[PDB]
């Protein structure tokens, strides 16, 4: 029932926006005059993407389950559904970029200071944003208002002219949004772990501590990225290539999928940030002092 889903969405949105605000304040106030590294820029881009995704998805999709009619107009109906999709795409892409950066910063530890620079990171972020904008064009193209035969209500639906294009776009976004980035992240982190196991072999205590911390972080981020966007995509695939039963169990499944998709973006700021020693140091330096 909506009486619980609405408050759950509100709580998740509040937690996510608070985490994103804290992260962006920590990353913006700390300006000692040093060139921003690629990791900090990627974290800032991820925080901005998550903020844009949470500010344009939860408070608007909550109206879909709260009010039985769309009262936001065609402008909002075509604006928010495009901006939140672009935000999700750029967030997944900056996740993949941070993964490949952490990959190339370990196997090329000596060449790391030369390869990853500020201008290269800026160009990568720009190309990522351009690709995310160019990929979500069919969303803004198709998504619009719809009026039933009663002509007494208006909805904000996709309304594709042909299922042959909708199914193709669903398959394309499922391949290029969930499978390929997850596989790339897993490959990069497995290579990082293998390189650490082959190099860090001095049998010291600090080495084992660093290895176990890296393994725990990799496992956490992998299981999060694996179980976060799986229900949403599998529900979309089931609804696009089959019959979706109108049962309370299906409603609970959709609610849990939305909750997991929102929790992904709400917990991303507290996974890649607030756990690194340098990030906590910068926080305790610029926020409290």
């Amino acid at each position: 029932e909506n009486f619980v889903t609405l408050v759950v969405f509100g709580l998740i949105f509040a937690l996510g926006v608070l985490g994103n605000s804290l992260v962006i304040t920590v990353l913006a106030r700390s300006k000692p005059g040093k060139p921003r590294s690629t990791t900090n820029l990627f974290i800032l881009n991820l925080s901005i993407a998550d903020l844009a995704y949470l500010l344009f998805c939860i408070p608007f999709q909550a109206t879909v389950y709260a009010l039985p009619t769309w009262v936001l107009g065609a402008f909002i109906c075509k604006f928010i559904h495009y901006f939140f999709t672009v935000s999700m795409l750029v967030s997944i892409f900056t996740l993949a970029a941070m993964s490949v950066d952490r990959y190339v910063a370990i196997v090329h530890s000596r060449r790391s200071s030369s390869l990853r620079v500020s201008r290269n990171a800026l160009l990568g972020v720009g190309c990522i944003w351009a690709l995310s904008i160019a990929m979500a064009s069919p969303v803004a193209y198709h998504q619009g208002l719809f009026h039933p035969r009663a002509s007494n209500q208006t909805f904000c639906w996709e309304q594709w002219p042909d299922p042959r294009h909708k199914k193709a776009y669903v398959v394309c976004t499922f391949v290029f949004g969930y499978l390929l980035p997850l596989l790339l992240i897993c490959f990069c982190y497995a290579k990082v772990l293998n390189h650490l196991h082959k190099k860090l072999k001095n049998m010291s205590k600090k080495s084992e501590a660093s290895k176990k911390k890296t393994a725990q972080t990799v496992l956490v981020v992998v299981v999060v990225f694996g179980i976060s966007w799986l229900p949403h995509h599998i529900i979309h695939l089931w609804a696009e290539f089959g019959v979706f039963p109108l049962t309370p169990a299906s409603f609970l499944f959709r609610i849990t999928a939305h909750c997991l998709a929102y929790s992904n973006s709400s917990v991303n700021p507290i996974i890649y940030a607030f756990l690194s020693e340098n990030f906590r140091k910068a926080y305790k330096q610029v926020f409290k002092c």
Binding site: E1, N2, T5, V64, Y65, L67, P68, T69, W70, F146, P148, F155, C156, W157, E158, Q159, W160, K166, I235, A239, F244, L246, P248, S250, F251, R254
Partner: peptide
């Protein structure tokens, strides 16, 4: 809470 609005939002303009 599975009204016509969410059904149409999920399945498109073909749930009727």
């Amino acid at each position: 809470g599975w009204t016509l609005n969410s059904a149409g939002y999920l399945l498109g303009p073909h749930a009727v």
